Amino acid sequence: KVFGRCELAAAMKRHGLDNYRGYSLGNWVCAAKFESNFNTQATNRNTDGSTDYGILQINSRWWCNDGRTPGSRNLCNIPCSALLSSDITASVNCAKKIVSDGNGMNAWVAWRNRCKGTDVQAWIRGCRL
């Protein structure tokens, strides 16, 4: 499923991401935009053999199991395919564990290089929330 900007903002807010660990909703929508372009089915393979899944491009080396990333962990305890669902619940729950880790949203390269230090609120303006 390809979410609309405001549609995603509303779904993320309902799932408790607004101000989660101090990150305003605009940060999460901005990250999703540049990580997957709001597409829940986005997948990208990395040189180390791991793969990123979903709207927030969660990596299989540490967070989910895809059965083809040798000696990787499954910290979110879920098959990576669950992260491609049109229901963002699994992605959100896992993202919450990721951002609670010492490095926060810097864990997402797209956020660090394209959202951090920008006017992230612009991502939710005009939306009914």
> Which uninterrupted H or E stretch holds 53?
strand 51-53
7 — alpha (psi -120 to 50), left (phi > 0) or beta? alpha
Q: Are the beta carbons of 5 and 29 closer than 8 angstroms?
A: yes
Residue (of 92, 86, 126, 90) closest to 17 by Cα position: 92
Classify burial at 128, counting beta carbons within 10 Å of its beta carbon; exposed 0-12, middle 13-18, buried 19 or more: exposed
- Tokens of residue 69, six digits: 């990333």
Secondary structure tally for the chain: helices H, strands E: 4, 3
Which of the residues are catalytic?
Answer: 35, 52
Q: Which residue has the tokens 């609670």?
A: 100
The annotation status of 101 as a binding-site residue, yes or no, is yes
Per the structure, the complete domain to which residue 121 belongs is given by 1-129
Q: Which residue has the tokens 């509303």?
A: 10
CA–CA–CA angle 22, 116, 10 (5° rounding): 55
Count structural domains, the chain: 1
Q: Which residues contact 45 (CB under 8 A, 6 or more apart)?
A: 51, 52
| Method by which this entry was solved | X-ray
Q: Supply the CATH number for residue 19's domain.
A: 1.10.530.10
Distance CA(67)–CA(81), nearest Å, equals 11
- What resolution, expressed in A, was reported for this entry? 2.0
